[PDB]
Design a protein around this ligand. Structure first.
Ligand SMILES: CCOc1nc(N)nc2c1C(=O)N([C@@H]1CCCC[C@@H]1O)C2
Ligand SMILES: CCOc1nc(N)nc2c1C(=O)N([C@@H]1CCCC[C@@H]1O)C2
Ligand SMILES: N[C@@H](CCCC[NH3+])C(=O)O
Ligand SMILES: N[C@@H](CCCC[NH3+])C(=O)O
Lengths: 462, 462
């Protein structure tokens, strides 16, 4: 609290002295990593004539006499510690240097009874705030910058999420997918059931809506002649937060002409497995529960109605009235579809461990997905539940316009108190070849793979 | 207008007949491209026993007698045209098929006095809207889906923008950069001078601000130990539209520890050149003006004050009063910095052809960029003007906090009528190693490379 001020003192009396604590440039030559990787086994307490210039953060100090010792930590986490040139050197070192301070050092590299000793040295930046040694998982998230410095785990994760996301891109691109960019500000926001964030434009004297999802535009792409498209990026759903939900988040969507939810469920499996392999290296996923979640080999596929039927010891179908459902609903603790999914989730959903697609969903609650090819009353959507998390949905995509138009009229009357995406429908009545969309949640993906909270999967939330 | 209805008729009387015009699946085996690429020179009017199943869009028809002919166009643009099985076949073909209709065909492939002839065939989708044969550059943008189908140029561009953006990622990643993701909804929006879009959260009973730029968060990353970071993605600036300006757009930012605006100007050059090469294949850039813009080899670097001095036949410096500037301003047609840039742009800026960085900018108007190392009164920012477009800016980055804090107080009093990013400043007073940010505009990048309007560079604007 106090030593805040002391650090400011130390800054001032380096300006007026004309030494620079925020130098433009400082001729670093190697990363601590690069040093390590060059010099694995050096005979301890022998020397080598590799001059280098390295920068780092002083995190351990042990100042004593003619000689000070200190740990330098590259930002990536790597570590290298530190007669030679000048006593004034030592006095500045002793008097000027605190911890959390960024420091360049020149010199040759040696083994300690692996450090370096100084031709030159200089401050690259003066911290006017000492690093704390514990911090609340909440304070942590509010100051990720410190987290990242002091807490290793923050580092690896941040890097992982990145590694994963590269993995995804690598994979889709290997399969001949083209990443596209579609609007975020939209005249009306479609592609999912969520309340949008609305904002005012000065330029058009109108409101605008942050995209809850890209599907409608991504579809317009397929129309326009895209074989295979994805768009990995952020969506905004104006609603509550919870372990699995957060109002802005990063989402994959995917679309493949000439293929069905059967095929896309396959891709989605391989996709996820490739990711694990690229970014983690095992399909036997370690967890803070000491446990290991296996995701290798093949994954089960069950139907919603069937699997639910077995669960309630009773046949349930598209046919089953609301009253029956409602009643069964009560026996345990709006409309048909909503009840089926509720019941399904509430019974079969919860119970699952290993990786499982469910498929064949109540039409009532899947207006964008095609009617099932043989079975009446249902659509060709899957969900994919992975270690007990709804991670992804695939669809055989509703290409028919008039069906689709109807699909909305019903949805629309649903919340009336007395406007459709006419352009989207225009799009469809130009032709849209058969295709299967997926959607996947990137935090849930990591969460599902790791057991980390949604608050740890991303750099900066609130 | 009328033939709208006829197409709907044709749809209905295929449902009630139990044939399907929006089939879930249709067993395509090859893309028209794949066919072509397999069968270059086939002896014309000879045959081959490669059965395949291909889909396409019927765009040319010539129905006549026992035999109909029609061009099929893959979405990517490729083309293949089309006794065998059944007369009913021909009757459906004649009666059922219109243009813009998506069509699967099975059979073996042959050379025409390169088409295919039909084992099987089926509709994959029925267009209830005929393609128009011209359309306004505005109507075009409002229905990109049609544009893409009927207008080749729409295609290539869409693909280019994608190719470019992959190029960028390829390049940065080759140089050891890590793409990150930072908030879009921000408690206050910083990183540039623009009015934000504001939106209400239901959850927090508060307003929120769409990011005008990532710099502040991207900086917090560098603090946290990122060596090299970028973030390619969308920003929102709540302001006018014009040939170079649009309220939501896609932007690269970049940050490199231990390097200066000198270095980043180098990267930015190589980056741009690599892109051209990957996505275009020449640095001698063809244009609708018949002309060619050369971007190869090295590019000029001039200083703002100097270059302006020469322009007005008079010495201008940090020192030059507002009154003088204002006066010179009048001689041709707020504050110091604003005048210098205005004058510079208005005189030297306009005059440039070949690719040129300007550097050494008035501090007044660059609060985030470090003070120049030797020269007083200026900062270490460059702009990069490419074929007469402001495409990119680099900075040697202001790491000092107290300076930075001050920088804002001045900015803030500037628009007072009587709140700073305290967290950002907190971040900085933990330490931020010397580094150089860039920012680049993706549409301007393409615009600069091609001569295409900002309205053609993106898929869906308004
Ligand atoms: C990380 C928080 O993720 C989400 N937050 C909200 N608020 N809503 C959704 C997710 C998420 O991951 N979603 C996915 C969307 C595609 C299908 C799987 C899943 O529903 C919805
Ligand atoms: C395609 C429209 O681009 C822009 N629109 C607005 N409204 N503002 C800017 C751009 C753009 O490309 N910008 C760039 C930002 C980084 C530095 C170069 C350039 O200023 C600002
Ligand atoms: N739009 C879906 C994702 C794609 C589903 C397949 N078309 C969602 O928001 O969940
Ligand atoms: N934030 C800048 C781009 C990065 C400049 C370098 N720090 C802008 O909005 O133009």
């Amino acid at each position: 609290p106090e030593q805040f001020r002391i650090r400011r003192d130390k800054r001032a009396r380096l300006l007026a002295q004309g030494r620079d604590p925020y130098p433009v440039a400082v001729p670093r030559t190697h990363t601590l990593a690069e040093v390590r990787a060059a010099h694995p086994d050096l005979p301890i307490d022998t020397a080598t004539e590799d001059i280098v210039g390295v920068a780092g953060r002083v995190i351990f100090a042990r100042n004593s006499g003619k000689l000070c010792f200190a740990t330098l930590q590259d930002g990536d986490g790597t570590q290298l510690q530190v007669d030679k040139v000048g006593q004034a050197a030592l006095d500045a070192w002793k008097a000027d240097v605190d911890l959390g301070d960024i420091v360049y050092v020149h010199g040759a590299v040696i083994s300690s009874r692996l450090s370096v000793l100084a031709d030159c040295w200089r401050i690259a930046a003066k911290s006017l705030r000492p690093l704390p040694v514990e911090m609340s998982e909440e304070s942590r998230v509010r100051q990720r910058y410190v987290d990242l410095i002091v807490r290793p785990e923050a580092r690896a994760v941040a890097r992982l999420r990145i590694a994963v996301v590269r993995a995804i891109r690598t994979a889709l691109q290997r399969r001949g997918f083209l990443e596209v960019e579609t609007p975020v500000l939209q005249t009306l926001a479609g592609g999912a059931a969520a309340r949008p964030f609305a904002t005012h434009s000065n330029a058009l004297d109108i409101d605008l809506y942050l995209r809850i999802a890209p599907e409608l535009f991504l579809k317009r792409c397929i129309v326009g002649g895209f074989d295979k498209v994805f768009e990995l990026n952020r969506v905004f759903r104006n609603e509550g937060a919870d372990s699995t939900h957060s109002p802005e988040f990063s989402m994959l969507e995917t679309y493949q002409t000439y293929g069905t939810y059967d095929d896309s469920a396959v891709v989605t499996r391989e996709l996820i497995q490739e990711v694990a392999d690229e970014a983690i290296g095992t399909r036997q996923l370690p967890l803070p529960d000491g446990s290991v979640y296996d995701i290798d080999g093949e994954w089960a596929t069950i139907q919603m109605y069937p699997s639910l039927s077995v669960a309630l010891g009773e046949e349930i179908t598209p046919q089953t009235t609301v009253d029956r459902l409602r009643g069964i609903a009560d026996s345990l603790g709006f409309g048909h579809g909503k009840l089926i999914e509720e019941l399904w989730e509430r019974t079969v959903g919860k119970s699952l461990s290993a990786p499982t697609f469910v498929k064949d969903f109540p039409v009532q609650t899947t207006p964008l997905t095609r009617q099932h090819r043989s079975i009446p009353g249902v659509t060709e959507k899957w969900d994919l539940y992975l270690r007990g998390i709804e991670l992804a949905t695939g669809y055989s995509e509703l290409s028919d316009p008039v069906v689709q138009r109807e699909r909305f009229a019903d949805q629309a009357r649903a919340a009336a108190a007395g406007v459709l995406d006419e352009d989207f429908l225009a799009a469809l009545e130009y032709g849209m070849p058969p295709c299967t969309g997926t959607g996947m949640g990137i935090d849930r993906l990591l969460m599902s793979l790791t057991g980390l909270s949604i608050r740890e999967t991303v750099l900066f939330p609130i």
